[PDB]
Amino acid sequence: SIVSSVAPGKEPGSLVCIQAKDGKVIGMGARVHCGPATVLVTAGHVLKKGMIADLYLAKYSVSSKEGKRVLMDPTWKIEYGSLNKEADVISVQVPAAVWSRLGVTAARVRKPTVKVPVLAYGGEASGLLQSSQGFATPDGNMSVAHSCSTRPGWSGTPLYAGSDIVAIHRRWNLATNLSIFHANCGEMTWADMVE
C-alpha cells in the first residue's frame, strides 16, 4: 500500500477528521448525499467514543489557512446505522452551518466492485493528512475487504474510488459496504461568528 503525504487542503472535499479535545485524531468520516440532503457518515465505534470524551469535527481551511473545528453536538439526529460489529456504521444529520464553517462538500456513495482501486485518508492533524492505496472487494453481505494501510485513528475513513465513496473503514482490513445502508436514503459569516 503506497502511503503518501497529502498537501494541506488536498484531501477530498467530503473528508473530516474526528478529534478529541486535545486534537488527537481518533477517527475519520465524510459528508455524503442522502436523498434531498446530506449526512455525516463514520464508524459507529468512533461516535461511541463520545461517551469517553468530547468529539470535534475537524477540517483544514485553505481560504483561512488554518484548522477549523466544531464540537459534535450530542443532540444531532441519526439517519441510519447499526452498532453490530459486522456493520459498525452511523450517519448523523449535521446542520448546514457546521458543514459551512468547516468547508465540507458532499460526496456520492457508489457500490464497490471486485478489486476496485481505492484511496483511504487519515493522519494526525487536519492539515497533515496521508493517503494509502489499495484494492477493495465486497463480501456479498455488508462488508468489504481492503488492502489500504491504516492506523488506529483511521476508523470511519471512506474508501474513495475516484470521486465517490464505496465503503467506510472499520478495523484490521475490513470496511462497511455503505451502498447497503444508503439504499434507505463582507468579512465574517454568522456561522464563523457564533463558533
Numbering used by the authors: 5 to 176, 183 to 195, 256 to 265
Describing publication, verbatim:
Its cis and trans activity is mediated by the naturally unfolded virus-genome-linked protein (VPg). The overall fold change of Δ117Pro is typical for CLP and is very similar to the structure of SeMV Pro.
The VPg helix is somewhat amphipathic, having W260 and V264 side chains located towards the VPg site, and T259, D262, and E265 side chains exposed to the outside environment, so the VPg–Pro interaction is also strengthened by hydrophobic interactions. However, in the Δ117Pro chain B, Δ117Procm, and Δ117Pro-E/A-VPg cases, D92 is directed towards H49, as would be expected in an active Pro. Similar major structural changes have not been observed for the closely related SeMV Pro, the in cis active structure, which is very similar to VPg bound, a completely in trans-active RGMoV Pro.
